[PDB]
């Protein structure tokens, strides 16, 4: 059980993307079973450019892409976008005080897909905006490693991989 | 070989839809090798709202989605439906008596799925009917654990991750 | 290591097709190594009726899909056909007297495809021929299975599983 | 963890291709965790005719396809072509001496995919280039592997399989 750090990582010229699952939670039953209490889902981290071959990590913004959004995306049609509007605090005290809104529209010559994450703070009228072009070929890979991905974060692996082991059982 | 509950949920303002695989079944030969004996398939329950965030699952109606069935939902084109009749005590004296129906149209505006499940008892003059929207990133998210899963209902995954340690002995 | 069998069927009023994994084949080297020295394919095996909810298994014709022939299949238009010609001596001396024909056909309505194996016995004047037809639903599930089953066949799932274990080692 | 050698394999008149997968590379973190630090590939192997039933192995040009470039591949339109450029020696002394080019092309008549992998050493006046024709089905055969194996290539099916037991624990 050791831990993978394994970030998918798209670097271009005024800024970087890296996109890393996370597991779903369970819970121990009585009997023993485990239940899913939380999908899966993918954490996306934007970072600015801030020098040569470098970008400035300490003024990331992250944005958690739901099982749901993420069927949004492998969905696209090639002139369609999609935008999602999450409060991160959303319960909390702080609630409505912060937007992030993530953006994905395609590239006005069919080259590709934009992304844009706006992280709003409108009670102090800051606006934090990552903008990254993502090519054909770099969103090709995204829908395939996502569509890979998406029957982990439901938990569907724990229920493929356990046919070959409870059938003997 | 500990039991997993990993139902996919879709809640919605009058109804919610939850989805969970069943693996395919065995038989053991004298031999020691295992034969199928039964494909897997998907348990579809429908419950109507009945509160905020509550869904009267007392009065749930399921559907059980055979590997055929889930093949034709994978391969709708953009204005077509299906319709899947069940007649859940064939055989059973209580042949002909009710009737199951599940129908997955498009959405008049191309924004998705509409699914219904009808449960339909003559002799006693009922019908009850659950429907609910699906949205084309929802049924995206469908689409891609279905394929992920059909290769394990037909017991081919069995076959699969067989090859690597087979293959030494 | 148990044997598993999982072919799959598709049974119809004058005909039924069962379709069966078979896994790849390989040499142990001195370095402890393997190497592998046949691609695995599919076992297709096709009865005629025989009698109410019966198929004559005793005459049943086989045919081997490879590799590239299931690539055909997945890549096959709506209105594209593929025939395939196998003769099952080549090299032995019986080679040229026995062919092997799968023919598969796109459905005249849009509803399916046409499975036709046809083994011929020039020298002693007979033709067997079995014909199946498959809904657009049970072709999709095909598709599935076969896309799913190809890494398996060519080996490299037995990459795929071995980068968790050797990573570690 | 032994090792296993599968490379996919296409045998024509002129040329032949392998296709051999490598897998990421990882560090270990003193916390135990690991680390991706270079993500996996796939080795394409070209050699030219050289004789009945074989190929000049001795002869062969190689081509290293990254993540990325896969995911042109499993993006092209049917009449769209990719053409990607290599030098072996980026960073060392010989820089800028040796290019690599692969192109891919479509064949005129809709039929399939041509390769051209070109070696050109200016200095030497010499370019070494091998072309292969590649059939639809064949192509299909390598897109639905690349799918396969472009999650684990990025180390996202160590996460995936990692799911099932640090649930547990």
Redesign the interface.
Known sequence: ????????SIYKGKAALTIE?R??E?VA?E??????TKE?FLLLQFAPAAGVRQYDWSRKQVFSLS??????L??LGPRES?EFFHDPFKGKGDEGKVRKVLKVEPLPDGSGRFFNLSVQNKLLNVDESVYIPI???????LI??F??????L????????????????
């Open positions: 059980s050791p831990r993978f750090y394994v970030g998918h699952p597991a779903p369970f039953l009997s023993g079973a485990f239940k899913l899966g099982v749901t959004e993420i069927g949004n492998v969905s999609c090519t054909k070929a770099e969103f090709a890979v395939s490693a569509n890979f991905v998406l029957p982990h439901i938990g569907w692996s724990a229920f493929a991989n356990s046919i070959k082991a409870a059938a003997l059982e």
